Amino acid sequence: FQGPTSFHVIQTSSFTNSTWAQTQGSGWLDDLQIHGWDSDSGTAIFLKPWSKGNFSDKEVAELEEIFRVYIFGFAREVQDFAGDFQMKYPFEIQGIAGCELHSGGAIVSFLRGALGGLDFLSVKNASCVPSPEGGSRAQKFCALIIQYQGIMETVRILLYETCPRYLLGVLNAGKADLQRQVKPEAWLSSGPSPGPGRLQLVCHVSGFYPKPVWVMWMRGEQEQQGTQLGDILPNANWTWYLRATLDVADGEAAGLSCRVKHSSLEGQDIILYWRGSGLN
Amino acid sequence: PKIQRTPKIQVYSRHPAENGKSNFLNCYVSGFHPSDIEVDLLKNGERIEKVEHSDLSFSKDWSFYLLYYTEFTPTEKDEYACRVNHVTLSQPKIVKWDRD
C-alpha cells in the first residue's frame, strides 16, 4: 500500500527563564499533519474527519488528558531541576514519539528527545537511554526519570501497545485521502551556470501525491546521470514540488528531455522536450 | 544545545507562473534553530495580510521548518518576496520570488 506508514507526535518546549515555558505539539502521518495541539484549551485539534482513527471518544479523551498532564508536568519538573542540571536559559527541548509499519507487517516504535537541537535521549526496550551528545546531563536525566512512579510504564504502553493499534486504525480510517493519487504538472526552464559556454536546465514537477516520484533528464532512452535533484518541498494541501537540474554545455542541450514517473500516471510518463534557440 | 542555525528560505509558486492567472506563492523556511521566528510574505515590498502557515514541525536533525503561503496572481511587474527574522539574522532577510 502507498502513502504514509508512520504516526508520531512531536513536542517543542521553549524555556525562557525560571518561570516561563511554552510547549507546541502536533500529530503526524509521515510529514502530513493530522492533529494540532491547542495550548488555549489543553486539547487536541483533529485536522481531518478521520483523525481519531478507530479510537472511541473516551479513549481519545484519556489520551488528551495524558498529554495535557504531561505537558504541564514536564515544564514544571524541568524548571524544578534546571538548577541541579546546570541549565542556562533560554533553552529549547524537542521530542518525537510514535511507531512505523514496515515491509512484512512489523510495527516498530520510537521515542527521541533533544536539548539545544542535539540528541539527548531515546527510549529503547522501554528503558531511558542517554545519547552521547547529551553527556552526563542526559545520564542524570535518565537516572532521574525512572524514579517517577508510572511514567516509564505509561510510556511503554503508549509506544508498544497503544500506538500500533492507533496507527493501523487511522491508516484505514484515512485511506481515501492517504492513498489518493494526484497527478503532478511539469514544466521546463533554464538559467545561467558559472561554466564557460554552459547553462543549467530545470525540470519542475509539482502537485503530485503520494510523495515518491522519479524525475530524470534524458537523451532518448539514456538517463543523464548528471541529473541533480533539489529538495522535495511542500505545497499546502498535501502535494509536493521537486526540481531536477542538469548542467550542460551550450551546444549540447539539444536532444534533452525530462521524464517524470509517478504512481498516479498509470504508466503514461510525462515527457517534456527541451528545444533550442528560445523555442520554450 | 549551544549553536544556533540560520533559516534556509525557499520561495516558489505552486503552478508555473502565467501573468493574470491565479496561483499560490509558497515560502518554505527550514533548517533553523531555535524555533522563535517571524515570517511575512511581501507584495511590492508591502506585507501581505491574508497569509496561512503551518504549525511548527522539525526534521530528523531537529531543525525546525514552516510553510507560509498565499493566493496571488503574478503579473509582469509585480514583485513578491518572503521576509524572515530570526535570532541568527541581524536584520530581516528578504528572498524574492524568481519564476526563472
Ligand SMILES: *[C@@H]1O[C@H](CO[C@@H]2O[C@@H](C)[C@@H](O)[C@@H](O)[C@@H]2O)[C@@H](O[C@@H]2O[C@H](CO)[C@@H](O[C@@H]3O[C@H](CO[C@H]4O[C@H](CO)[C@@H](O)[C@H](O)[C@@H]4O)[C@@H](O)[C@H](O[C@H]4O[C@H](CO)[C@@H](O)[C@H](O)[C@@H]4O)[C@@H]3O)[C@H](O)[C@H]2NC(C)=O)[C@H](O[C@@H]2O[C@@H](C)[C@@H](O)[C@@H](O)[C@@H]2O)[C@H]1NC(C)=O
Ligand atoms: C483498532 O484497529 C486495530 C487494528 O484492527 C485491524 O485492522 C484495522 C485496519 C481493521 O481492518 C480492523 O477490522 C482490524 O481488526 C485493532 O487492533 C487489533 O485488534 C485485534 C482484535 O480485534 C487483534 O487481533 C488479536 O490478535 C491476537 C494476537 O496478537 C498477538 O500476536 C500478534 C501476531 O500474531 C501480534 O501482532 C500482537 O501484537 C500480539 O502479540 C490474537 O490472539 C487474537 O485472537 C483471538 O481473537 C480472535 C478474534 O479477534 C479469534 O479469532 C481468536 O480465536 C482468538 O480468540 C486476535 O487475533 C490485533 O492483534 C490488534 N492489532 C494490533 C496491532 O494491536 C484495535 O482493536 C483493539 O485493540 C486490540 C489490541 C484488542 O485489544 C482489541 O480487542 C481492541 O478492540 C482497534 N480498536 C482500537 C480501540 O484500537
Ligand SMILES: CC/C=C\C/C=C\CCCCCCCC/C=C\C/C=C\C/C=C\CCCCCCC(=O)O[C@H](COC(=O)CCCCCCCCCCC)COP(=O)(O)OCC[N+](C)(C)C
Ligand atoms: C507530546 C504530545 C503533544 C501533542 C500531541 C498532539 C496530538 C495528540 C492527539 C491525541 C489523539 C490521538 C491519539 C494517538 C496517540 C497514540 C499513541 C501515541 C504515540 C506515542 C506516545 C508515547 C509517548 C508519549 C510521551 C508522553 C509521556 C507521558 C507519560 C506519563 O505518564 O506522563 C504523564 C504525567 O505527567 C507528568 O507529570 C510528567 C512529568 C515528568 C516529565 C518527564 C517525562 C519524559 C518522558 C520521556 C521518557 C523517557 C502522564 O500522566 P498520567 O499519569 O498517565 O495520567 C494523568 C493522571 N490523571 C489520570 C489523574 C489525569
Ligand SMILES: *[C@@H]1O[C@H](CO[C@@H]2O[C@@H](C)[C@@H](O)[C@@H](O)[C@@H]2O)[C@@H](O[C@@H]2O[C@H](CO)[C@@H](O[C@@H]3O[C@H](CO)[C@@H](O)[C@H](O)[C@@H]3O)[C@H](O)[C@H]2NC(C)=O)[C@H](O[C@@H]2O[C@@H](C)[C@@H](O)[C@@H](O)[C@@H]2O)[C@H]1NC(C)=O
Ligand atoms: C520570565 O519571563 C517572563 C516573560 O517575559 C516576556 O516573555 C519573554 C518570552 C520575553 O519576550 C520577555 O521579553 C517578555 O517580557 C516574565 O514575565 C513578564 O514580565 C513582564 C515584566 O518584566 C510583564 O510585562 C508587563 O506586562 C503588563 C501586562 O501584562 C504591563 O502592564 C507592563 O507594562 C509590563 O509590560 C509580562 O506581562 C510578564 N509575562 C508573563 C507573566 O507572562 C517574567 O517576569 C516575572 O513575572 C512578572 C509577572 C513579574 O512579576 C516580574 O517581576 C517577574 O520577574 C520573567 N521572570 C524572570 C525571573 O526573569
Ligand SMILES: CCCC/C=C/CCCCCCCCCC(=O)O
Ligand atoms: C512527545 C514525547 C517525546 C519525549 C520527549 C522527551 C524530552 C527529552 C528531553 C529531556 C530533558 C532535557 C533536559 C533536562 C532538564 C531537567 O530535567 O532538569
Ligand code: NA
Ligand atoms: Na511546519
